[model samples]
Target: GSEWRRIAYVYDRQTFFPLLENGRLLKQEGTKTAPSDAPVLVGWKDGDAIAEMTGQLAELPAAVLGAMSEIHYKPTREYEDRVIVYMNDGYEVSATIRQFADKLSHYPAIAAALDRNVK
Candidate 1:
């Protein structure tokens, strides 16, 4: 079996979207006609997962799901608030992914929300 992991959030290289590995799934699909969000307050449980959209939940462009995908492990600190992500795919520590970090700060809502829930 694969090693049990504590996933942070999945990251999309281009879209920069997030979806928890154990994310939510809508029991009934929501649409323009039937507009309703997911039943669960926070979809995933432990560390949480993705939020449902059509299937179960519709994650807004701004929704924070769970896990950072592209990155194998958490990034290393560079200078200031900057973090260098060591991509799991074909990449290096040299710094080919400049924009990835830009997303790091902006998409922190999911991360932040989790904190609030715990409190």
Candidate 2:
């Protein structure tokens, strides 16, 4: 999907995952009128170079989600696959028909898609 050339992550609001998209290692110290919220986020983007193959981006806290997703994967009442991306590192993820059935519990739009998978 060539939606965006690069996928990026920024945990701190004042950083790469900023409320802005300019590539200069810039900081958003003045973006937010003041401080509020966790100032954190974890996400992905698509790119071909620089930010795509850079050393600094990978060393940041966004990559740190590997530490958190490890815990998220620990939720005892977990679903095998809820459409996610992560650094569960080497966690064995599970999926099954009941998972789709569960989605039918609230999201009915997936009924057609689930029917396809079922077929």
Candidate 3:
């Protein structure tokens, strides 16, 4: 049987818009809808295989889910904050804290809500 392998969030190369939970690409600013605002997911599949599905926090594979349980962010030596995802077998993934910054900035209302609520 194929074992669990690498899984990572998919983003647009041109816009960096993350794939959302509803199986659709994230929307551009003002055009955002409730369903479009859901968080991104990691593309899930066996080693070196094409992603067969995207898994949310609750639906991730056993090993990936376990790794996520303790996932957290830390500041890099360059003073950039990054969220780290480390799995078993020495697999790892990293994302800048600003990964979604540009996307958020595209949506004024949602950005306002984030500014008001996030702090």
Candidate 4:
């Protein structure tokens, strides 16, 4: 447990902190010091639905993911849900999903890691 937590912490610090510091998570509030324009949608649903949507989202294009740096979720209630999707600048185009997938595919190791994690 500690190892996993440590890995997560390191990953967050190495991969996420700079983004946060640069306002990459909340950049659209008229603060050049904020994060990007990621879009997140949340709703109550069965675990299956949530899982399916996450999978589908992951399958989206790399251009999309690179354009989007994060997605956050939390339980709104015992059965409800909340979601947040973060988008990168200049990624509002229709081809975002395909582009994201393409970009991700270029990273064989990352793609393999994700594939291995899929159930």
lDDT of each: 0.28, 0.27, 0.33, 0.33
The global Cα lDDT (0 to 1) of model 3 is 0.33
Scored by Cα lDDT, where does model 1 land? 0.28
Off by over 4 Å in 4: 1-54, 74-81, 90-119
TM-score versus the correct structure, for each prediction:
0.19, 0.17, 0.23, 0.27
Kindly provide the TM-score of model 1 when superposed on the true structure, using C-alpha atoms: 0.19
RMSD of 4: 12.4
Better of 1 and 3 by TM-score: 3
Q: Which stretches of candidate 1 lie over 4 Å from their true place?
A: 6-102
Error of 3 at 102 (Å): 10
Tens digits of per-residue lDDT, candidate 3, 1-93, equal 843322223322322233322233432521222112233233222212112122332243222333321223444787444445443334555
Candidate achieving higher TM-score, 2 or 3? 3
lDDT tens string, model 4, 58-95?
45433333344444444445423333334443222221
Better of 1 and 4 by TM-score: 4
**Weakest 10 consecutive residues, lDDT, candidate 4?**
3-12
Question: Candidate 2: RMSD over Cα atoms?
Answer: 14.0
